[PDB]
Design an enzyme around this catalytic site. Structure first.
Site, PDB file in Angstrom:
ATOM      1  N   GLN A 153       0.783  -1.211  -0.031  1.00  0.00           N
ATOM      2  CA  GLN A 153      -0.006   0.102  -0.119  1.00  0.00           C
ATOM      3  C   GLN A 153       1.017   1.288  -0.064  1.00  0.00           C
ATOM      4  O   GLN A 153       0.499   2.358  -0.232  1.00  0.00           O
ATOM      5  CB  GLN A 153      -1.123  -0.140   1.082  1.00  0.00           C
ATOM      6  CG  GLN A 153      -0.418  -0.050   2.346  1.00  0.00           C
ATOM      7  CD  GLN A 153      -1.504   0.556   3.558  1.00  0.00           C
ATOM      8  OE1 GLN A 153      -1.070   0.598   4.748  1.00  0.00           O
ATOM      9  NE2 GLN A 153      -2.845   0.523   3.306  1.00  0.00           N
TER      10      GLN A 153
ATOM     11  N   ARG B 185       0.538   5.541   8.023  1.00  0.00           N
ATOM     12  CA  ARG B 185      -0.447   5.658   6.854  1.00  0.00           C
ATOM     13  C   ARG B 185       0.443   6.045   5.453  1.00  0.00           C
ATOM     14  O   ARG B 185       1.493   5.501   5.380  1.00  0.00           O
ATOM     15  CB  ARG B 185      -1.143   7.186   7.451  1.00  0.00           C
ATOM     16  CG  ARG B 185      -2.018   6.782   8.613  1.00  0.00           C
ATOM     17  CD  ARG B 185      -3.177   7.724   8.844  1.00  0.00           C
ATOM     18  NE  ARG B 185      -4.472   7.565   8.119  1.00  0.00           N
ATOM     19  CZ  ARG B 185      -5.204   8.460   7.831  1.00  0.00           C
ATOM     20  NH1 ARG B 185      -5.510   9.352   8.599  1.00  0.00           N
ATOM     21  NH2 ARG B 185      -6.256   8.121   7.086  1.00  0.00           N
TER      22      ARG B 185
ATOM     23  N   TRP C 145      -1.029  10.533   0.063  1.00  0.00           N
ATOM     24  CA  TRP C 145      -1.946  10.441  -0.954  1.00  0.00           C
ATOM     25  C   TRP C 145      -1.623  10.953  -2.246  1.00  0.00           C
ATOM     26  O   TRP C 145      -2.185  12.137  -2.520  1.00  0.00           O
ATOM     27  CB  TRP C 145      -3.114  10.842  -0.105  1.00  0.00           C
ATOM     28  CG  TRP C 145      -3.813   9.725   0.806  1.00  0.00           C
ATOM     29  CD1 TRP C 145      -2.959   8.947   1.548  1.00  0.00           C
ATOM     30  CD2 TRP C 145      -4.934  10.008   1.510  1.00  0.00           C
ATOM     31  NE1 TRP C 145      -3.764   8.274   2.451  1.00  0.00           N
ATOM     32  CE2 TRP C 145      -4.834   9.066   2.605  1.00  0.00           C
ATOM     33  CE3 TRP C 145      -5.979  10.931   1.578  1.00  0.00           C
ATOM     34  CZ2 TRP C 145      -5.968   8.813   3.377  1.00  0.00           C
ATOM     35  CZ3 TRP C 145      -7.147  10.748   2.475  1.00  0.00           C
ATOM     36  CH2 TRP C 145      -7.023   9.662   3.311  1.00  0.00           C
TER      37      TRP C 145
ATOM     38  N   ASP D  77      -9.740   2.721  -1.742  1.00  0.00           N
ATOM     39  CA  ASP D  77     -10.031   2.945  -0.344  1.00  0.00           C
ATOM     40  C   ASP D  77     -10.862   4.116  -0.429  1.00  0.00           C
ATOM     41  O   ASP D  77     -11.027   4.811  -1.613  1.00  0.00           O
ATOM     42  CB  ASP D  77      -8.850   3.206   0.415  1.00  0.00           C
ATOM     43  CG  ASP D  77      -9.017   2.950   2.216  1.00  0.00           C
ATOM     44  OD1 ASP D  77     -10.030   2.524   2.331  1.00  0.00           O
ATOM     45  OD2 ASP D  77      -7.980   3.045   2.884  1.00  0.00           O
TER      46      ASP D  77
ATOM     47  N   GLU E  93     -16.239   7.878   1.663  1.00  0.00           N
ATOM     48  CA  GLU E  93     -17.137   8.298   2.418  1.00  0.00           C
ATOM     49  C   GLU E  93     -17.204   9.526   2.942  1.00  0.00           C
ATOM     50  O   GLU E  93     -18.102   9.762   4.048  1.00  0.00           O
ATOM     51  CB  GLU E  93     -17.164   7.343   3.695  1.00  0.00           C
ATOM     52  CG  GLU E  93     -16.842   5.587   3.425  1.00  0.00           C
ATOM     53  CD  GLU E  93     -15.554   5.558   3.287  1.00  0.00           C
ATOM     54  OE1 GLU E  93     -15.306   4.162   3.603  1.00  0.00           O
ATOM     55  OE2 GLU E  93     -14.283   6.369   3.254  1.00  0.00           O
TER      56      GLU E  93
ATOM     57  N   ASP F  50     -11.797  -1.595   7.906  1.00  0.00           N
ATOM     58  CA  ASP F  50     -11.204  -1.689   9.192  1.00  0.00           C
ATOM     59  C   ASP F  50     -11.924  -2.264  10.333  1.00  0.00           C
ATOM     60  O   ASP F  50     -12.834  -1.720  10.810  1.00  0.00           O
ATOM     61  CB  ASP F  50     -10.554  -0.208   9.767  1.00  0.00           C
ATOM     62  CG  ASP F  50      -9.886   0.517   8.466  1.00  0.00           C
ATOM     63  OD1 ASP F  50      -9.251  -0.131   7.609  1.00  0.00           O
ATOM     64  OD2 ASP F  50      -9.940   1.777   8.640  1.00  0.00           O
TER      65      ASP F  50
ATOM     66  N   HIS G  60      -2.698  -7.704   6.180  1.00  0.00           N
ATOM     67  CA  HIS G  60      -2.724  -6.286   6.320  1.00  0.00           C
ATOM     68  C   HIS G  60      -1.687  -6.102   7.366  1.00  0.00           C
ATOM     69  O   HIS G  60      -2.169  -6.935   8.561  1.00  0.00           O
ATOM     70  CB  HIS G  60      -3.995  -5.648   6.723  1.00  0.00           C
ATOM     71  CG  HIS G  60      -4.030  -4.057   6.285  1.00  0.00           C
ATOM     72  ND1 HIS G  60      -2.979  -3.144   6.651  1.00  0.00           N
ATOM     73  CD2 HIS G  60      -4.983  -3.140   5.745  1.00  0.00           C
ATOM     74  CE1 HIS G  60      -3.325  -2.031   6.145  1.00  0.00           C
ATOM     75  NE2 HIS G  60      -4.542  -2.222   5.429  1.00  0.00           N
TER      76      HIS G  60
END
Ligand SMILES: *[C@@H]1[C@@H](N)[C@H](CS(=O)(=O)O)[C@@H](O)[C@H](O)[C@H]1O
Ligand SMILES: *[C@@H]1[C@@H](N)[C@H](CS(=O)(=O)O)[C@@H](O)[C@H](O)[C@H]1O
Ligand SMILES: [K+]
Ligand SMILES: [K+]
Lengths: 672, 671
Positions: free
Chosen positions: B281, B294, B297, B398, B401, B465, B530
């Site tokens: 990722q 994290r 992006w 991902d 939302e 998650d 993961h």
């Protein structure tokens, strides 16, 4: 300009009292809504889960107004013309605006009135509020209940109270709700109902008063001053008596565990110079251990095994100027003789099956004495006369009143959804009539935690109920201050708290420091009284060490020294309904900052109190309004503004006005 | 057969194939309309939504008129009053279709009551993580962060609320959908993307609230659940077959660069683990926050963090190991893609006319405005150029939302309506990039967010998650209702992170949990691991020899079953029959199966009952009436509650003796 003007506009209409515009209706901005709901109410040990399901809510946009014999009749519907769904009489009565409401449709069980408001308006009252004095910005259900342990979902204690016992509550929960608010525009509004209501102050342009019935009527009254307003409001609801003279002799000591232990603690304390008014022994009728801690056997008669020779000791203590206080509540335990007597005479509330309704109070079950039955009421009053007053009690805690289940059946055949909120006042009236009919009014004082409209007359003294033994804002020492202020604004002007708080649960244990800080505040209230708490062995007590005992003794001497002033405050409360503990804005109307203070109060006109309500503080920031002030302990002078003062244990942030006619008396506190 | 509208004395009844669905009387009206003023506060993908209802009007009075073969129904509050809602009721395809038209612009609240029984069960509403059968509660349908903990009684949830406002509750989900399936063997679909709340608390009716008057609803009946789900995928669409390479084994979640990938690959191959590919990722770059490890992006290969990846991808392909990456629909302010988008005007705006910046937790990103067709094509070209052409065989897609209700979009439609549309739009971007490149069935992406229509546009769901714990509401177990619910509304390919993801508030992933999770994962379409949000706080697959050997063994279980799983994935593509099925789908007559949500049928022939609690050596399982064989022991069982031993490596799994695959399932005794 004076009295009730109803101006008819093209849009709609406006109702005003003494030029204060209260009600405003247009087709586009209607003021009244009616509808239907189907509520779910689950009770668990005094905690209520209340959900509404609203099926209809109808805006009554269209009004026809008719001028009549001094009064106005206004008919309201959903559509132009339309059938009348709500009919109003607007009139002046006894110098107030009175609005009577009459509905046609039996389906209507939901009512909403919008009263016009400003962005900056503040609102106060709604009974005893423990989280918010100024209620602006939130909504407040008004349903008497357990107030919650913790009362804030963000804290560990609240969370655990919810998880284990469904008992955490929230910011609006209270033993003493009331459908009555006071506005900063210098009017009060009262809704005559005992149904569930929810006063919604979230909207900038209006307050919305929801009621789960169409209320018979509302009353508004205006005034020039907050002092005048509270005088008028006690004019409506009633006024408390003067406290008995003996209260001013010092601390009411909360002690349990029998005659011997009370005598030994009384002697130990007197010897160290503590001023004692009386001893309060809640277990006089018997103890009861549960998982909650040390509770009581709910059967209101002296227990000779636990309290041997109490009959003789009470009179002995009286000859040494020490009064005796007990405990009663409006429920009776199944194991006791009073329950048995009541059941046989039919004095208990019933279930749908026609038998005694049994309420879960927490690992024990009790009947509800049905105060809708006048015969049962007289019976319970005789129980008080016989077992408490004639036995020589000078007072008592009159606990509870908030646990009426909505599925009970009562003698008067009125729905429990309507009787639930009425119960506290009925419970108060029982105490008042027993005391009055015995000719002991002014000599016996009882104290209550629960309330509703009308305890302004029937309750001789409030206390803040069970606080957590902690420093939290929502349920600790601080919570008492808004509780006193809120209750004073709607006419209950005598308030006090358990010195030390009560509730030890979920890891909360009372510390030495908290007990001492609580005594500091208590000395600047009408009554100093201590409580052992639910788990006495888990909480620091007043005899926990010499430093603590000496601290409480000192604070007892502070209170007694101030007795003449406090008496004058209690007499003013009786005469004009001006509360003993006052919000700062009541004497400094022009000071904008005082309308949002709730952790400071004026103790009468001449003393400002700002209790230390946080742990481990040596100093405390105080806001003083513009006046000439004297720090009571140092004699140092201050004018208006934010100031930090030292506040070591024993030296609470308290100030008096130099202009006070009591300045000579307040000066004596420098040397104590 | 078809749509009968009976006129009764006091109102009307609408039926489809003899199932009575809509019932209106003056005394018991079915439709209500009104006005509300909502407050929506967003904080890092969590939404606080409160309504203030000012009007709700019961439409008690109906006038019914005939037409074509359609019926027109006018509805008011009073007899012969002004018409406030107008219906067309017709049969279209072979469905009941109800179109709605309002007159009054003030109406922004709608409530339909559809008749129900005491014992009726309801399923669907998207991916539901706490309740499969929704009867007895109400379900807001608003895509969001699903919550950490998701149960106010637990410490984790409480802390997630206190610290981050992030605990959520039983109804929260990345994938809501205004579609439910009834045990009366019909589905109901409300065509809207607005906030809705399906209320199943009343014995006599379901109440469907929508924060608009919906354009139309569709009902369709069937004789069997198998037929129903076929029809429902007939409406919404069907997923492709997975790529063949997926069945080669576990997709390994690995971060921290090329060298680390090579080292893990060697260690695992040597222990005999079957690996389909590696999923990295952080291929485009890492980003550390207080939350943990994290990502940066910006959707382009990061040459410093992943040196020589371009060459290694092809090298790994020659050893039968595929490569998967990561993208989401947002762009970080620090990156070139953000800068490019801003200059081209591809980003959503605030009311001041500038780029709307959304708080993702200690960093801020712009929202690519998929209401702008030019911006859509641009993002698809970004996928073609930087991901597909670079040789990715797939990726996590991902999020979806986090559309705030105060954003301003090119199409100038209110964000209160665009918010729930975004997941499907995001899916469509992925689908079109893959389709236009001719790579459908060769490249697979997986998504956690959804709304109506991802039945076509999402190639594979994952459960998002989960907490790295054993809680029912957000741990290992929560995945099972998530797969079941999603299957009933037409998303039949589901999987989860092996080990879960979220390490917070004292939750750390244990060895045992990782092993149990791999056990369940082997009986799903895809095994993928993961590292989690905090890799050093969670036990990993290379944490010790026992764990590595356990995952190797489970990888061999999956591969051995590959032929059966392939058949299941083919059936899902052809008829929309989900790979993970509720027990009632094959045992309709068994009343106990309508309330089971922690067991599933893996195709027709395998029953799975994952051990979802800590420190268990055995597990009670409910078996419906059939001839079953415990996979590991060969012991035979008929119907009923039975306890079986379930040591680590031996999940409670059974196969039907009657299965045409019995030869294959027998091989699991010896693996
Ligand atoms: C009411 C009640 N909680 C207590 C008595 S018990 O018998 O229920 O335990 C009193 O001690 C409290 O002060 C009062 O709030
Ligand atoms: C989405 C997201 N929470 C993660 C990436 S990050 O850059 O936001 O940390 C993924 O690792 C998760 O698996 C996915 O839910
Ligand atoms: K309390
Ligand atoms: K989650």
């Amino acid at each position: 300009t004076k009295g009730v003007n109803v101006e008819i506009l093209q849009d709609g209409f406006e109702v005003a009292l003494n030029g204060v515009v209260l009600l405003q209706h247009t087709i586009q901005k209607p003021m009244l809504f009616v509808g239907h709901g189907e509520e779910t109410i689950e009770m668990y040990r005094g905690n209520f889960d209340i959900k509404d399901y609203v099926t209809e809510r109808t805006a009554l946009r269209y009004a026809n107004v008719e001028e009549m014999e001094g009064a106005y009749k206004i008919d309201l519907s959903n559509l132009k013309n339309g059938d009348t769904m709500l009919s109003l009489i607007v009139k002046e009565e006894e110098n107030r605006l009175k609005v009577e409401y009459q509905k046609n449709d039996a389906n209507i069980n939901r009512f909403w009135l919008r009263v016009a408001a400003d962005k900056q308006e503040k609102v106060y009252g709604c009974g005893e509020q423990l989280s918010h004095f100024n209620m602006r910005g939130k909504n407040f259900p008004l349903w008497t209940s357990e107030p919650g342990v913790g009362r804030n979902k963000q804290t560990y204690v609240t969370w655990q109270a919810d998880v284990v016992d469904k008992a955490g509550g929230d910011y609006y929960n209270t033993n003493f709700p009331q459908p009555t608010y006071v506005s900063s525009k210098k009017y009060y509004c009262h809704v005559e109902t005992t149904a569930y209501a929810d006063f919604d102050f979230r909207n900038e342009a209006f307050h919305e008063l929801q009621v789960w019935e169409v209320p018979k009527y509302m009353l508004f009254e205006t005034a020039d001053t907050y002092l005048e307003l509270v005088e008028k409001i006690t004019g409506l609801f009633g006024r408390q008596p003067e406290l008995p003279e003996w209260v001013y002799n010092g601390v009411v000591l909360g002690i349990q565990g029998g005659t011997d232990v009370v005598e030994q603690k009384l002697e130990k304390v007197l010897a160290k110079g503590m001023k004692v008014s009386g001893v309060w022994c809640q277990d006089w009728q018997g103890k009861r251990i549960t998982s909650f801690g040390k509770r009581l056997m709910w059967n209101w008669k002296w227990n000779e095994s636990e309290y041997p020779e109490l009959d003789k000791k009470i009179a002995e203590w009286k000859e040494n100027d020490i009064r005796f206080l007990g405990y009663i509540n409006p429920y009776v335990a199944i194991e006791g003789d009073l329950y048995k007597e009541a059941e046989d005479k039919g004095y208990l509330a019933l279930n749908t099956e026609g038998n005694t309704y049994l309420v879960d109070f927490g690992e024990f079950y009790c009947g509800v004495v049905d105060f809708t039955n006048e015969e049962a009421t007289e019976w319970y009053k005789q129980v008080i006369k016989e077992n408490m007053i004639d036995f020589g009690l000078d007072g008592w805690m009159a606990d509870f009143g908030e646990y009426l289940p909505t599925d009970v059946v009562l003698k008067n055949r009125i729905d429990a959804k309507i009787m639930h909120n009425a119960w506290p006042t009925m419970w108060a009236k029982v105490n008042y009539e027993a005391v009055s009919e015995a000719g002991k009014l002014g000599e016996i004082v009882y104290f209550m935690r629960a309330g509703y409209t009308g305890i302004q007359k029937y309750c001789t003294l409030l206390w803040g109920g069970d606080q957590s033994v902690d420093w939290s804002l929502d349920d600790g020492l601080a919570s008492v201050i808004p509780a006193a202020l809120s209750s004073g604004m709607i006419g209950c002007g005598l308030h006090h708290s358990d010195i030390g708080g009560y509730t030890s649960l979920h890891g909360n244990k009372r510390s030495k420091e908290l007990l001492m800080r609580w005594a500091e505040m208590g000395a600047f209230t009408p009554m100093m009284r201590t409580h052992e708490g639910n788990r006495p062995d888990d909480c620091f007590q007043f005899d926990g060490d010499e430093e603590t005992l000496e601290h409480l003794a000192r604070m007892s001497n502070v209170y007694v020294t101030m007795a003449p002033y406090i008496k004058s405050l209690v007499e003013e409360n009786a005469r004009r309904g001006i509360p003993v503990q006052r919000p700062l804005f009541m004497h400094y109307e022009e000071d904008e900052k005082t309308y949002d203070i709730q952790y400071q109060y004026l103790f009468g006109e001449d003393v400002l109190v700002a209790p230390v309500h946080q742990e481990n503080q040596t100093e405390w920031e105080v806001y003083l309004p513009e006046d000439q002030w004297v720090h009571v302990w140092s004699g140092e002078a201050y004018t208006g503004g934010s100031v930090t003062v030292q506040a070591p244990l024993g030296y609470p942030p308290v100030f008096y006005r130099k202009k006070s006619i009591w300045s000579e008396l307040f000066s004596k506190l420098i040397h104590i």
